[PDB]
Symmetry: C3
């Protein structure tokens, strides 16, 4: 459990979240404006080349419900009809070679954009739809300034714009390029017609392309849109000296309670519990489990685990082991090997039981459990545990917490111990009395059978059985490293155990 | 079946969308050049420039049974600027500058279609195409001079060979297209271009006056294979009354649920996949349901209480203020024996913390939340109104409001101590069930460390059964330990004192 | 454990990453240039209609710290003031209707772009910052080409460019479109003023809009930028016929003692994909690649279908699916010589009991996964597109026939997918009629065990290599300790069975 957090870091290292589907629902005030292109031919001044529409950019600033919002609109037309009027071939007759008009068969496009969060990084959009209201575009009065004679005026023209389909588009300009929202509008001819006064043309529906605004600042229409777009999870599109952080640990040296520590080290403190409560203040939250894992699977522990896996696989499959490497006792196995007297051999064989402890081949208190409990106590009670600094501190912890530990194995009422400090014992279960430590049997048992972690190691167990005379059940449970009886003793206030626990603390400090 | 709860809590850190798709498609690029003439003033013998322009062409051509709308845009770069002046007079034929295509120059062609490969193509890798080489021959452009003979530029042939491919963007006044950029190199051929009635001929290249030769387009076939990045949901181009209805559906299917098969299902490690693959129809290409449910799951009473238990063991182990403050019954306070709010009160307050022993792996028996999850799975699989959009926060409301009033027990040397959130507490013996005074300050020290077991077989029904349907020692031990073997044995032997308890639990998981 | 890896694959199926937040910090040499637009009115040539600025593109190639980098810089100005100077209403007096001048109120924009990686796919950016140094920009000598008269020369003018905020922009052209970075610069007038000679204008500050480059090839200013952008993790965005034979060549070369030592380890995803000397792309996407095919197979579909049938057997009861049930009642764990047929059919779901964590012994799929991890670290032919569906063909075709047992009151009931059943007592091996309709009621709920030590070899062993009570109980329970102890005692009646298991783990 408390070592299952390490096993989980390992397992989920492959993951070493970023996007989010955000829904947006906001009201808008589309204020657009037509624009006309007027090219007058030379000569006397009686001949006009074209009278057409021009896409017109228009940036404005209106008031939302307690916010001031800048916006930017661009109106355009498609499918307009090209009419013309030629009354004579002489330089003194009024002629307009080709002018554009809008009718049913045409459509009116309006690109819209704001500075809001919806259009900040909008490149992908689905579930798009909008409810727009209909308006009325009325043309104005443009006086064709002829040199001499009369002055025809194109006056009138009304047309109702009704909502239509919506899409995306891009407003291109010489400064900014904007991924914008394209509203379509259909046209219904109204009663006011446009007619050129003092001319033989009148009673023709449409809108004139000389003064469509009719001296207005804009044409206003309000709307609402609802869509779902893609945006990065992070809505935005010195820390310490490690010596001094070690001194912060030395300030949190020793004062973990023992009942509380043993109760804390019996909880599956999974990723959520382990990275939620720690220091209760961070904005980013950008997968800090991944941020610590990317440094966790770069260290000696992880490389040694992978080396164990590869020596097992290779040597099993076909590979011979170098003359320095030797098989002690039974058939070859990384678990049973003298890397390279008996003290040395047993320490070397114990250096892999640390990996057994974090390969789910344990039976008891699983020392890495207590190491992780201490870690979760320290990074909780502390404050300089910044997400940049927790990576490689979890690894310094996992690699420098409780280096000198000890293990044991049980076989038919006969226990065989071992430790990385070069110590090796063999002792009976019922009546503790040492035995000649049996090599070629300790290896054969520890290779396969479940191993136990010697928090109650044979020295302390002897001292305890001697002074605090022990019952059979208590002895069996201490051998099996049972937290129930361990905490019953810690509440019985047994100094022979409190000393061992304070020594574990002084060894798990750093 | 609480493995779903455990894995949700564990993988809540992850809180998929995009997808790598391969597209291998044929194309018929029907492209076209366009020339830009500018004729100087004076008489009409003087030409300012004769150059190229980016030339767009949109059309609609037939695929193998599909009508595909397409869009091409051709252009040339690195062309050579030749000139030719017959003199300095207003009447002499002069072309101050004209562009010609040679080997050193390159031809660019942007291509786009209305198929699926191009709708949201913004990132691409493994890009490659198999294009064939073509030939391009010059046209016949008759320079209109005011008076006299009529020179005509005629000839020129250059072969276009396929080359590297990349991306580009075809801008217009109406649309903007994320397009594919085919590049082409040039190699001279035998037909050379020359102006009739003029002292120039037998020089290689392709003129820029009229490349199309009057052809409506030049056509070249190809195929392209690539790998692009796109959103999963292909839709990026082109609750009180409902929850009450679902409550009613649960409170009408609860009794239609069975007991034997439910106990059979409650021994299954139903992982995320096992729970979210067997949806009724996998309705339409749903999102990551684990993330969808978790982003609601980790805001609730359950998860916040887990975090509180965590932090109250943490601070308590860090400094002695919290342990000393929680005011336990006595003889330890790690965090668990805390009374926020007599015996009844303490026991209920402690059992509301024992609610986490189930999803803390501190159990040994039937693990009641397993039954809750199983009933949830059964109902959301046999229901019709359950949507993937409303299942988030329903997987949380169920976990939070299933079996609010529940009971737990602890065994210690042939002495069994029960307790419940409803404020009940019974102490008794294992073999000969006989009530006994309940021992506070011992029940707490035992439930802290010793494994805790669920009260599906609680003392009341246990004693009714021991009287009517009197039981043997091994079966009684296994009922205490809540074994599925003996439980299913009784459920197949049709014991109504267990069937009624199970139906009660069902009426409590009704929601 | 070695089956827990399959259960974990199934669990993490929801993850079936691609993007990443990368930090780029690179040095750059901003070599920009101004450009002016001199428009001359008609008449004689003394009257100037306008002298404005123009967006000035410049494309070049410069040397970074061991790199040769191609770059592109676009200079522009904004908020420049418009001054005028008229010497008379005649066509023969030197007049400039409008000329643009620079002061504090104005700003200078510079769009910058390179061919490096930082600019290849820059579409999203955050935490943008930059360190730029200030420079001085001065105007040259633009001689107004008067047909006749004096020669006015606009000369002088200097301005100090101080850094300002940075943003994004897009440089558009008739050839290329570049997602570029917009460096903005504020201006402070310097001591040298701009003045037109042989003309009544002097001792006025700013930068002349006529010749701001001063005849230079560029204005060089160094800089550095830092950002955090989104990028595809795959850093490139901008053919079984012989595999089976390799497996069957590697099958028996593998040993047995060390294989059993390795088949007890929870070789989770890290441990399973660490010893693979993968490619730069496989190490990034291996797990999801194999998972997207692992949840497409008969194994996954059968698991999901058992789950669907358990849900439907708990719900349907009022209309309960009455297909068949031998035993107490419908379970969907027992859904069906007739006896041999039923047993094989039940064993095709005891494989799911195996990969559902409801076993006690060596859990044959675990041995299969151990063989897999021992073969795919040796096989030379392993590749990113290749391991996916090899993991699945392995999981599907390793040990097709496999047997199981259930113990009840010292009476073992066996079963096998090969249509064989054996009932027998633990202490005294002697067969018994196989009790169907009880074997099912027991295998349904009681734990099951695997047939690594199956009855045939078990009896051969109890005959030849006389066996003790505890050793026999542990061999029934399928204990790896006693298993490895026999394998080290060199018992051919177990070595042969293990070799058979290998040869079935063949692919
Ligand atoms: C066949 O395998 C054995 C061990 O399994 C090995 O010693 C031998 O060299 C192999 N044969 C060849 C030709 O390599």
């Amino acid at each position: 459990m408390a070592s299952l957090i390490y096993r989980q870091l390992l397992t989920n290292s492959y993951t070493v979240s970023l996007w989010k589907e955000m829904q947006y629902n906001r009201d808008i005030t589309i204020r657009f404006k037509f624009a006309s292109s007027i090219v007058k031919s030379g000569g006397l001044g009686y001949k006009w080349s074209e009278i057409s529409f021009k896409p017109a950019n228009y940036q404005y600033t209106y008031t939302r419900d307690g916010e001031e919002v800048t916006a930017h609109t661009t109106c355009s037309v498609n499918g307009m009809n090209d009419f013309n009027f030629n009354g004579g071939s002489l330089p003194t007759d009024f002629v307009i070679s080709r002018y554009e008009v809008i009718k049913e068969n045409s459509y009116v496009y309006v690109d819209y954009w704001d500075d809001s969060q919806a259009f900040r990084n909008m490149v992908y959009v689905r579930s798009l739809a909008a409810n727009l209201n209909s308006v009325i575009c009325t043309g104005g009065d443009y006086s064709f300034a002829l040199p001499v004679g009369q002055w025809p005026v194109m006056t009138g023209g009304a047309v109702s714009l009704h909502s239509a389909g919506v899409t995306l588009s891009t407003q291109f300009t010489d400064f900014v390029s904007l991924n914008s929202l394209r509203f379509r509008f259909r046209l219904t001819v109204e009663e006011p017609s446009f007619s050129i006064t003092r001319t033989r043309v009148s009673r023709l529906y449409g809108l004139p392309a000389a003064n469509p605004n009719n001296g207005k600042e804009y044409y206003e229409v309000a709307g609402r849109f609802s869509l779902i777009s893609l945006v990065p999870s992070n809505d935005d599109y010195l820390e310490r000296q490690l010596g001094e952080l070690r001194e912060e640990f030395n300030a949190l040296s020793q004062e973990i309670a023992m009942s509380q520590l043993i109760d804390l080290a019996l909880l599956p403190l999974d990723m959520f519990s382990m990275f939620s409560g720690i220091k209760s203040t961070i904005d980013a939250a950008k997968s800090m489990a991944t941020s610590v894992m990317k440094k966790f699977k770069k260290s000696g522990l992880a490389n040694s685990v992978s080396t164990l896996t590869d020596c097992l696989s290779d040597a099993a499959s076909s590979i011979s082991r170098g003359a320095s490497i030797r098989s002690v006792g039974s058939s070859a196995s990384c678990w049973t090997d003298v890397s390279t007297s008996i003290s040395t051999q047993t320490s070397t064989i114990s250096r892999r039981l640390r990996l057994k402890e974090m390969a789910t081949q344990t039976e008891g208190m699983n020392f890495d459990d207590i190491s992780a409990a201490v870690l979760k106590t320290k990074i909780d009670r502390s404050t300089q545990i910044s997400p940049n600094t927790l990576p490689d501190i979890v690894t310094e912890a996992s690699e420098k917490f409780i280096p000198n530990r000890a293990y044991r194995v049980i076989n038919n009422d006969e226990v065989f111990e071992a430790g990385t400090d070069g110590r090796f014992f063999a002792y009976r279960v019922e009546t503790f009395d040492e035995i000649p430590f049996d090599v070629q049997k300790f290896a054969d048992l520890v290779t396969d059978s479940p191993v136990i972690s010697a928090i109650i190691d044979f020295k302390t167990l002897k001292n305890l059985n001697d002074n605090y005379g022990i019952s059979r059940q208590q002895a069996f449970n201490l051998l099996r490293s049972d937290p129930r009886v361990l905490r019953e003793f810690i509440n019985q206030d047994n100094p022979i155990i409190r000393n061992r626990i304070e020594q574990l603390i002084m060894q798990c400090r750093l």
